[PDB]
Write an enzyme that holds these catalytic residues in place. Structure first.
Site, PDB file in Angstrom:
ATOM      1  N   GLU A  81       3.345  -1.726  -2.051  1.00 53.54           N
ATOM      2  CA  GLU A  81       2.412  -1.648  -0.934  1.00 53.54           C
ATOM      3  C   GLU A  81       2.102  -0.181  -0.691  1.00 53.54           C
ATOM      4  O   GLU A  81       2.419   0.666  -1.531  1.00 53.54           O
ATOM      5  CB  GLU A  81       2.966  -2.314   0.320  1.00 53.54           C
ATOM      6  CG  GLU A  81       3.249  -3.789   0.145  1.00 53.54           C
ATOM      7  CD  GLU A  81       1.990  -4.603  -0.011  1.00 53.54           C
ATOM      8  OE1 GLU A  81       1.061  -4.420   0.798  1.00 53.54           O
ATOM      9  OE2 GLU A  81       1.920  -5.421  -0.951  1.00 53.54           O
ATOM     10  N   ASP A  82       1.497   0.144   0.448  1.00 51.57           N
ATOM     11  CA  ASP A  82       1.000   1.495   0.674  1.00 51.57           C
ATOM     12  C   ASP A  82       2.101   2.545   0.614  1.00 51.57           C
ATOM     13  O   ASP A  82       1.828   3.733   0.797  1.00 51.57           O
ATOM     14  CB  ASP A  82       0.288   1.571   2.020  1.00 51.57           C
ATOM     15  CG  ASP A  82      -0.854   0.593   2.122  1.00 51.57           C
ATOM     16  OD1 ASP A  82      -1.233   0.020   1.080  1.00 51.57           O
ATOM     17  OD2 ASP A  82      -1.373   0.395   3.240  1.00 51.57           O
ATOM     18  N   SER A  83       3.342   2.134   0.369  1.00 45.20           N
ATOM     19  CA  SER A  83       4.410   3.092   0.146  1.00 45.20           C
ATOM     20  C   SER A  83       4.107   3.930  -1.093  1.00 45.20           C
ATOM     21  O   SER A  83       3.099   3.742  -1.778  1.00 45.20           O
ATOM     22  CB  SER A  83       5.744   2.373  -0.007  1.00 45.20           C
ATOM     23  OG  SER A  83       5.753   1.587  -1.180  1.00 45.20           O
ATOM     24  N   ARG A  86      -9.990  -0.308  -0.244  1.00 43.14           N
ATOM     25  CA  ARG A  86     -10.391   0.782   0.631  1.00 43.14           C
ATOM     26  C   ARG A  86     -11.402   1.707  -0.023  1.00 43.14           C
ATOM     27  O   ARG A  86     -12.017   2.521   0.672  1.00 43.14           O
ATOM     28  CB  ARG A  86      -9.162   1.584   1.055  1.00 43.14           C
ATOM     29  CG  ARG A  86      -7.926   0.730   1.238  1.00 43.14           C
ATOM     30  CD  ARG A  86      -6.819   1.481   1.943  1.00 43.14           C
ATOM     31  NE  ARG A  86      -5.502   1.009   1.534  1.00 43.14           N
ATOM     32  CZ  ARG A  86      -5.061  -0.230   1.700  1.00 43.14           C
ATOM     33  NH1 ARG A  86      -5.797  -1.155   2.295  1.00 43.14           N
ATOM     34  NH2 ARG A  86      -3.849  -0.551   1.257  1.00 43.14           N
TER      35      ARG A  86
END
Ligand SMILES: [Mg+2]
Ligand SMILES: [Zn+2]
Ligand SMILES: [Zn+2]
Ligand SMILES: [Zn+2]
EC number: 2.7.7.6
Lengths: 490, 32, 56, 391, 49, 270, 120, 70, 46, 49
Positions: A199-201, A383
């Site tokens: 994930e955005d980690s 995004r």
RNA sequence: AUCGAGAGGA
């Protein structure tokens, strides 16, 4: 700008000329240099009074017709419909539509604010990303002032090595970002890897943290002053004695001085007392005198925050306006990046560290270069943030060629120019590099988009959020647990 | 020629912007 | 609505999350500093005197 | 905590480094990511409540939810991309890496599958090693548009006795779909076996993807010259059609659509034409893209990608709108002081010809900011209105 | 590098945020809701500044 | 995997680079050697700092970190014990080197305090260790900090032996290149491209030492990775040749430790 | 706060044996060996060598978690051949090749010293 | 604040090249790229380190240093 | 010992004591930074 | 610091109404930042020059 | 301590 038909020699042309720019630059250099002789000392006011620029209000700008750029005024655009500049890599700009221009924009990208004008290529992102970046640029750690040492501010965060961006907008010279930058250049690899940046980690090179990457200083100043009351009572600094005071705190008083203060350079941790202050207040009973003589004194000390530790940076002893002794104690500590910390580029891409890998375990190129970050490729498609990739590419080219990459919003720098420069530097035009697994050393069947980019270390470190409790303090009214991490609340 | 001709280009507006920010600054409104 | 329908509670923790491809679906990772604050009261029975005494 | 699955009971595993760590497939239930999220932990204090938590709220029991009859937990970004890339027809595996893949499955029974290719070299297909993670007795028979037990596209799925027989494994099979592998295994072998399957597939696919690799670069948004010219011609044709409609309307020859006055009919026609233009350009770009293109791979895997993103990054961004209507004449009869009064052209009312790769002109930048602000305000309002409805 | 457009009060530094307001001495005519007994109203916040 | 195996061919040599072709060896061994040179070769570095006085601009942690990162001579590091394997009290002469830095602003202009000013005050016992690595053409070491007229800095730096895994400051190597198969003959990589990969992808500088693939030749599916091109660069604490030799020594030591553990377990089983 | 000391990567702790051989019940003649304070640097080497033994039927490894410097290796040899013997032979072959590599590199560098002394 | 020692990603000692870098930039009127190459910063991992450094120490050293006569 | 209280915008080492005026003797200033300690501070170069 | 010193505020939206205001009107061109605005209740009510 | 206000975060 003012647009007038003064050019009888041709079509309606801008009012400002190159002589005025020459004089402005001469004034700039005269300010830089000595031997003041610039009689034609132009400033903004000189242009304003000479009739070259205006001050157009929102109400007045309804009656005018503005040109987006001086090129919109050339008669060639109005008349010359055919040209050889059909570079398919440039923005599709609408042609010359009118001829009754009254003013011309000094420049686009001046429609942006302070926090927005530090974004590289904001016109390649989508607006929500730009807003997120503008909000998160105020949390980037950096040097807020050169005199931070003198200022005894509470909660000051400063980077060890703040680096200038490799992609800098043209307004950063007026915002002084290049003089007090907030962030660092990190060799980022947009790769899918062991799976700990899923994930955005993200993944952080541990050996880069060990060499000083994103290290930051933290300062916290404590204050305490003798209480106003002087009418037969007071509240004075001292070193409380276990045998001559009440409810003296559970922390350690052994670190205090006779002044009730810790000398700078002492290592304070936990709930240790840093300021020693007592209230020689009631009970004013002679029975207490029969008991402990100064039993009337009640501890009023200030311990360190239970979740913090560090070293006393500086202790300041002044007197408030009323003449009572006044003291400020500053405790500093270094906050090295951890797994739970939070970083972000200049395109609204948040992400916490997932796991840190040592230099040997990270993927490496044929030139030995290993990344300081590995960002999951799944953050891009939804995004978009094409500005992120263009900035990484421009930064790679700038680092190789050794100069600054102009990431201004509405310039005419296309991805194909950057790609051509990168290819001239002996690299793949689009920024892909063949990397090696690191664990096995074998080639990765995929080529990883590699290069530098500017990342910001935001606030919100995990050690400032982690909190657990079991049967701590309770309230008085409802007898439920108190609220707040600082109060050990539930 | 240059003094009275050679109209401004895109790059030359940054001299004007620098002059503006030199005389005004980023907090001119509050001080004024 | 703030003291009966919902309230602060003991034996609870909060902190950031991260991902672990190496963790079972129903399994979670608890930092030591958190596991050393939250506690569970076990009753001493002949099946767990040894382990519970060791924990003591 | 909007629904049941936002409160689930987990098994503990003490670790260092100060952050709770979750399996990547439970994030969707909690709707969590790792961009700074935080979670609350509660410990039962009695054997009764421990038993209640571990027999009622246990995560494996929550795989199939009563909200929609379909699973909640599925396979997510990296595992989804890796499982689609691993089960491709061209993905064969050597003995050396296959041994590690097998040892990475705890349930592996110690039997090495006979390779799909034997004589020239022993090469295992990705489907075989993935099947080693699928329990025996599981069948799937999903057929797509052109699936006929021999189709060369693998657009389908067939499993016989826990062996992937045919088709690529993607979000329709291992994702939380109505009749995927997750749902079938939960309704056939039980919750514990399905959680174990989550673990096994994650382990194998993550190992393979780590040793293969997968990235996204700026080169993934570029379309060759010919398709850029085709996109430009598409947009120009749309602009010409809009201009013809404008000429018809300005000549009073346009006939107002029943139930709408002249202006609304004209605006509807223009917005329809511009949307068709954007869609056509996006389709041109997408068909241009190669399988090498990593964005297209993420789109095909179902791993956080959509074709609208491809259209907006590699082709026209498209018409912007506020309040459901193309940009409004905020000034007197014009949207912005750089346009002459009474202008209805696409460029003057929110249309964005360029892509994100190519950039936005200042006016397109401002119109896109308008649209983004509309979206952000809507999100902020929902954040609380939906909660009140929930209560 | 300090711009300095703020106040120092009791040590702390304070910033006066520009409070936005609608202009005075401008005639604004706007429609009232149909159910109300008034159709249009012209409003002035007349002020001697 | 037979004894007279790996063969070496040093293309070019310097004192901060050794460029060689490592052939007749498995990829596992090449990668393990690379990882070991990066990670597990002991060297000397400053570990503890006692700041007697510091009125400089930089904080104490800042200067301690910088000092830890200063390379120190480590040719004879093998004759120094680990501080964890010594019976002294937090350091001694046989398991540490004690440096001390003292600076002051004698001149009104800026004074550059830098690693030339580190002086060893302990007893080296004739070992070739403790000297800060000064490679600057000006004879000046690594800039540590700067001083006004009145600023002062007195330190006591204790140097200790460690490997890069414990902390990156003990790394003897700067960056190791690594490649195999310039022409993608083994097809271990699939080239991302738009129109032609052979044109879009720059040709590796090592492509000159290998025969270009024949367009008609069938894919040699039996070929294995071999002939690895490596280029070890050393921060200067140890010579590059010794970096590689000690990397091989460290791999041998690790495998020997595995063998010794097996033998001990067998003896315990009797 | 919760960061463990970096020395726990290569220093054995209390009651932590370097190796632990556990016979595997899934297959015959198969054993699983756990290496403590080791990682891929040695695991990849050992597995790659074991796979060169014609009497070894299976050889794989895995680091179950990057947090812990641990390592598990599975070996399954043919009948008779003890897997511990296979591991011993693997280590011995690795040592012999490493020694040969070191000797060859020393010889080549000795040859190159003539130019190296003239280099920088 | 000071030139970093030991380049982050790779570990090359770029801390002794600040003075030489500045001297090449000013006295020899060399471009940033040519100055970086002249110092041996082969790869951009280190060229970013030297190139994008902000020497704030020069600005901190302007305040009075608790000095006897300053 | 009573060595303490270095003065700000000056250099005087005041070495004040209890009840002493907080002013600097020869500066008239009222800040008096407190004399960095004497016990050696131990740091780990990491 | 620089952004705070150049901030504004609209008391009108403090009522929490949900309507056409607190939107990026196009008369804002070149006068307030089209991108810098907070989240939550203040999105569109706090604007930066 | 309390109450009130603002800032920001999920
Ligand atoms: Mg989130
Ligand atoms: Zn010793
Ligand atoms: Zn470097
Ligand atoms: Zn003085």
């Amino acid at each position: 700008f003012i647009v007038e038909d003064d050019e009888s020699l041709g079509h309606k042309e801008l009012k400002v000329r190159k002589g005025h720019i020459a004089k402005l630059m001469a004034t700039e250099y005269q300010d830089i240099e000595g031997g003041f002789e610039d009689v034609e000392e132009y400033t903004w006011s000189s242009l304003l009074n000479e009739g070259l620029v205006e001050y157009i209000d929102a109400e007045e700008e309804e009656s005018i017709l503005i040109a987006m750029q001086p090129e919109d005024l050339e008669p060639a655009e109005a008349n010359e419909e055919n040209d050889l500049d059909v570079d398919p890599a440039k923005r599709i700009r609408v042609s010359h539509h009118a001829t009754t221009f009254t003013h011309c924009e000094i420049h686009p990208s001046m429609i942006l604010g302070v926090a927005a004008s530090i974004i590289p290529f904001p016109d390649h992102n989508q607006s929500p990303r730009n807003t997120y970046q503008s909000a998160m640029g105020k949390q980037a750690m950096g040097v807020f002032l050169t005199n931070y040492n003198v200022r005894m501010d509470t909660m000051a965060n400063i980077l060890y090595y703040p680096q200038k961006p490799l992609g800098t907008t043209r307004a950063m010279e007026y915002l002084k970002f290049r003089e007090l930058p907030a962030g660092q250049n990190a060799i980022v690899a947009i790769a899918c890897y062991s799976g700990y940046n899923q994930e955005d980690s993200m993944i952080m090179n541990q050996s880069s943290i060990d060499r000083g990457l994103f290290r930051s200083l933290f300062f916290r100043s404590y204050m305490d002053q003798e209480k106003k009351y002087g009418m037969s009572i007071t509240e004075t600094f001292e070193k409380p004695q276990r045998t001559n005071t009440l409810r003296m705190k559970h922390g350690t008083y052994d670190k205090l001085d006779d002044d009730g203060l810790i000398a700078p350079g002492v290592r304070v941790s936990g709930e240790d007392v840093i300021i020693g202050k007592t209230t020689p207040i009631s009970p004013d009973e002679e029975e207490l005198g029969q008991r402990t003589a100064y039993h009337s004194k009640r501890d009023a000390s200030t311990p360190l925050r239970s979740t913090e530790n560090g070293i006393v940076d500086q202790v300041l002893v002044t007197t408030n306006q009323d003449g009572l002794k006044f003291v400020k104690v500053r405790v500093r500590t270094t906050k090295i990046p951890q797994i739970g910390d939070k970083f972000a580029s200049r395109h609204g891409q948040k992400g916490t560290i997932g796991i840190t890998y040592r230099r040997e375990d990270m993927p490496f190129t044929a030139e030995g270069i290993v990344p300081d970050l590995i960002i999951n490729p799944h953050a891009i498609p939804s995004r978009m943030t094409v500005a992120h990739l263009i900035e990484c590419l421009l930064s790679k080219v700038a680092a190789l060629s050794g100069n600054e990459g102009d990431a201004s919003p509405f310039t005419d720098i296309t991805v194909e120019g950057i790609s051509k420069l990168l290819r001239e530097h002996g690299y793949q035009s689009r920024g892909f590099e063949v990397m090696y697994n690191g664990h096995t050393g074998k080639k990765l069947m995929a080529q990883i988009f590699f290069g530098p980019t500017y990342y910001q270390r935001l606030r919100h470190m995990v050690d400032d959020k982690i909190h657990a409790r079991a049967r701590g303090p309770m309230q008085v009214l409802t007898r439920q647990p108190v609220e707040g991490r600082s109060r050990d609340g539930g | 020629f240059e003094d009275e001709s050679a109209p401004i280009t895109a790059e030359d507006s940054w001299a004007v912007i620098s002059a503006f920010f030199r005389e005004k600054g980023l907090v001119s409104q509050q001080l004024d | 609505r703030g003291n009966l329908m919902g309230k602060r509670v003991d034996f609870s923790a909060r902190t950031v999350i991260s991902g672990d491809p190496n963790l079972e679906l129903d399994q979670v990772g608890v930092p030591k500093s958190i596991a050393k604050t939250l506690t569970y009261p076990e009753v001493v029975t002949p099946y767990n005197i040894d382990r519970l005494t060791q924990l003591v | 905590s909007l629904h049941k699955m936002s409160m689930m009971a987990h098994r503990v595993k003490v670790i260092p480094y100060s952050t709770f760590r979750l399996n990547l497939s439970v994030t969707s239930p909690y709707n969590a990511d790792f961009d700074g999220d935080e979670m609350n932990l509660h410990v039962p204090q009695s054997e009764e409540t421990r038993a209640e938590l571990s027999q009622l709220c246990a995560v494996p029991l929550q795989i199939v939810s009563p909200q929609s009859n379909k699973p909640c937990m599925g396979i997510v970004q990296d595992t989804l991309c890796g499982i689609r890339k691993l089960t491709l027809r061209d993905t064969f595996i050597e003995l050396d890496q296959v041994l590690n893949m097998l040892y990475w499955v705890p349930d592996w029974d110690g039997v090495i599958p006979t390779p799909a290719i034997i004589k020239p070299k022993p090469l295992w297909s990705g489907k075989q090693i993935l099947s080693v993670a699928i329990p025996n007795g599981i069948h799937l028979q999903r057929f797509d548009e052109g699936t006929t037990l021999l189709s060369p596209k693998d657009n389908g799925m067939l499993i016989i006795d826990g062996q992937i027989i045919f088709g690529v494994v993607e979000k329709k099979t291992v994702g939380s779909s109505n009749g995927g592998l997750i749902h079938v295994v939960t309704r056939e072998k039980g919750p514990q076996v399905c959680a174990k399957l989550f673990g096994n597939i994650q382990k194998v696919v993550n190992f393979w993807l780590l040793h293969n690799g997968f990235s996204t670069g700026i080169g993934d948004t570029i379309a060759d010259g010919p398709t850029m010219r085709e996109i430009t011609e598409t947009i120009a044709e749309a602009k010409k059609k809009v201009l013809d409609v404008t000429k018809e309307a300005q000549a009073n020859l346009l006939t107002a659509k029943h139930g709408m006055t002249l202006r609304e009919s004209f605006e509807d026609n223009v917005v329809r034409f511009l949307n068709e233009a954007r869609d056509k350009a996006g389709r041109l770009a997408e068909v241009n893209l190669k399988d090498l293109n990593n964005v297209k791979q993420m789109v095909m895997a179902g791993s956080k990608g959509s074709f609208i993103n491809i259209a907006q990054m590699s082709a026209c961004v498209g018409q912007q709108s506020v309040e459901g209507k193309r940009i409004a004449f905020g000034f007197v009869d014009r949207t912005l002081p750089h346009f002459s009064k009474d202008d209805y052209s696409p460029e003057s009312k929110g249309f964005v010809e360029n892509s994100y790769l190519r950039g936005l002109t200042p006016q397109e930048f401002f119109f896109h900011a308008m649209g983004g602000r509309e979206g952000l305000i809507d999100t902020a309002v929902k954040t609380a209105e939906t909660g009140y409805i929930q209560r | 590098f300090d711009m300095g457009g703020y106040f120092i009060i009791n040590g702390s530094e304070k910033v006066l945020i520009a409070q936005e307001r609608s202009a005075g001495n401008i005639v604004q005519v706007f429609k009232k809701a149909a159910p109300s007994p008034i159709s249009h109203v012209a409003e002035i916040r007349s002020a001697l500044e | 995997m037979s004894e007279e195996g790996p063969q070496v061919k040093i293309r070019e040599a310097s004192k901060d680079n050794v460029d060689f072709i490592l052939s007749n060896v498995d990829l596992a061994m090449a990668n393990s050697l690379r990882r070991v040179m990066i990670a597990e070769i002991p060297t000397l570095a400053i570990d503890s700092v006692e700041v007697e006085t510091n009125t400089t601009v930089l904080a104490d942690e800042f200067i301690a970190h910088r000092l830890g990162l200063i390379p120190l001579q480590s040719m004879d590091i093998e004759q120094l014990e680990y501080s964890r394997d010594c019976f002294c009290e937090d350091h001694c002469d046989k398991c540490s080197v004690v440096l001390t830095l003292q600076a002051f602003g004698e001149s009104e202009s800026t004074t550059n305090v830098y690693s030339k000013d580190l002086v060893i005050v302990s007893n080296l016992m004739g070992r070739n260790i403790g000297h800060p690595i000064i490679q600057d053409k000006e004879g000046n070491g690594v800039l540590i900090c700067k001083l006004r007229k009145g600023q002062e800095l007195k330190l006591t730096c204790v140097a200790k032996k460690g490997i890069a895994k414990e902390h990156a400051k003990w790394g003897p190597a700067a960056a190791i290149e690594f490649e195999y198969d310039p022409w993608n003959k083994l097809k271990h990589t699939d080239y991302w491209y738009e129109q032609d990969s052979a044109k879009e992808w720059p040709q590796s500088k090592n492509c000159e030492y290998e025969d270009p693939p024949n367009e008609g030749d069938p894919f040699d599916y039996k070929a294995q990775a071999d002939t690895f091109y490596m280029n070890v660069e050393s921060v200067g604490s140890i010579p590059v040749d010794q970096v590689v030799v000690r990397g091989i020594d460290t791999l041998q030591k690790k495998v020997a430790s595995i063998l010794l553990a097996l033998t001990q377990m067998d003896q315990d089983k009797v | 706060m919760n960061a463990p000391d970096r020395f726990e990567l290569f220093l054995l702790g209390e009651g932590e044996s370097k190796l632990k051989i556990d016979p595997d019940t899934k297959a015959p003649n198969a054993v699983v060996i756990t290496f403590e304070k080791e990682d891929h640097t040695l695991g990849n080497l050992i597995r790659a060598e074991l796979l060169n033994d014609r009497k070894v039927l299976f050889a794989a490894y895995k680091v179950e978690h990057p947090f812990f410097a641990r390592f598990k290796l599975r070996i399954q040899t043919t009948e008779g051949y003890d897997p511990k013997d296979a591991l011993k032979n693997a280590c011995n072959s690795i040592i012999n090749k490493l020694g040969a590599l070191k000797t060859n590199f020393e010889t080549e560098w000795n040859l190159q010293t003539l130019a190296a002394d003239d280099a920088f | 604040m000071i030139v970093p020692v030991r380049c982050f990603s790779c570990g090359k000692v770029v801390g002794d090249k600040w003075e030489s870098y500045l001297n090449l930039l000013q006295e020899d009127e060399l471009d940033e790229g040519t100055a970086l190459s002249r110092l041996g910063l082969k790869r951009y991992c280190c060229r970013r380190m030297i190139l994008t450094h902000v020497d704030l120490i020069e600005k901190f050293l302007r305040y009075n240093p608790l000095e006897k006569r300053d | 010992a009573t060595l303490k209280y270095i003065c700000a915008e000056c250099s005087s080492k005041l070495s004040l004591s209890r009840t002493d005026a907080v002013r600097c003797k020869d500066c008239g200033h009222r800040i008096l930074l407190k004399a960095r300690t004497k016990r050696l501070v131990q740091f780990e170069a990491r | 610091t620089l952004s705070h010193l150049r901030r504004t505020n609209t008391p009108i939206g403090r009522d929490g109404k949900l309507a056409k205001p607190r939107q990026l009107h196009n008369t804002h061109w070149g006068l307030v930042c089209p991108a810098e605005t907070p989240e939550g209740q203040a999105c569109g009510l706090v604007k930066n020059l």
